[PDB]
Amino acid sequence: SGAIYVGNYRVVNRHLATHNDWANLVWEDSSRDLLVSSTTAQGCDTIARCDCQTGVYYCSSRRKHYPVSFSKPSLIFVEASEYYPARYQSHLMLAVGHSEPGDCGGILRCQHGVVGIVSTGGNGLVGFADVRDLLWLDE
Numbered sequence: 001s002g003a004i005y006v007g008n009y010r011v012v013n014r015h016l017a018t019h020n021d022w023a024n025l026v027w028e029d030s031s032r033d034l035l036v037s038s039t040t041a042q043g044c045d046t047i048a049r050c051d052c053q054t055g056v057y058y059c060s061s062r063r064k065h066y067p068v069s070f071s072k073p074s075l076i077f078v079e080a081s082e083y084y085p086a087r088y089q090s091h092l093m094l095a096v097g098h099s100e101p102g103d104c105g106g107i108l109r110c111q112h113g114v115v116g117i118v119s120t121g122g123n124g125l126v127g128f129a130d131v132r133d134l135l136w137l138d139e
């Protein structure tokens, strides 16, 4: 689990969004595993606007942060799960690192701010949904 709180927005994995997220929906994209909802309180986070390919993510299944080198956001095949049919997930970045299903929502950051959130993984890989292209989160 986990979320990004920026301005009056909450960014979560679409497959983990709550009834309240859907009732206050701003935008969602099943191909990216992202959902953004509106909030009343001002958020705690800043979004990176950069091309970094190194950063640090939080891994809840180890209670630790790990440094990672990750690929540029791209269209990557993701196998069927309880949450989605087999499909290409867009704006996804892969890295070598530990992840388990409950790790979704962990934040990846670089020196500029929040880069994205854990969305996929397995077999020593971890995949992050990028949010750096969502310029409207900043206003």
Ligand SMILES: COc1ccccc1CC(=O)N1CCC[C@H](C(N)=O)CC1
Pocket: 015, 033, 078, 080, 081, 082, 083, 084, 089, 099, 100, 101, 102, 103, 104, 118, 119, 120, 121, 122, 123
């Ligand atoms: C952290 O992810 C993993 C880690 C280890 C093993 C498996 C996973 C992947 C995983 O749990 N899912 C469920 C959530 C949907 C996701 C997606 N974004 O399409 C792909 C499949």
Ligand SMILES: [Zn+2]
Pocket: 048, 049, 050, 051, 052, 110, 111, 112, 113
């Ligand atoms: Zn950066």
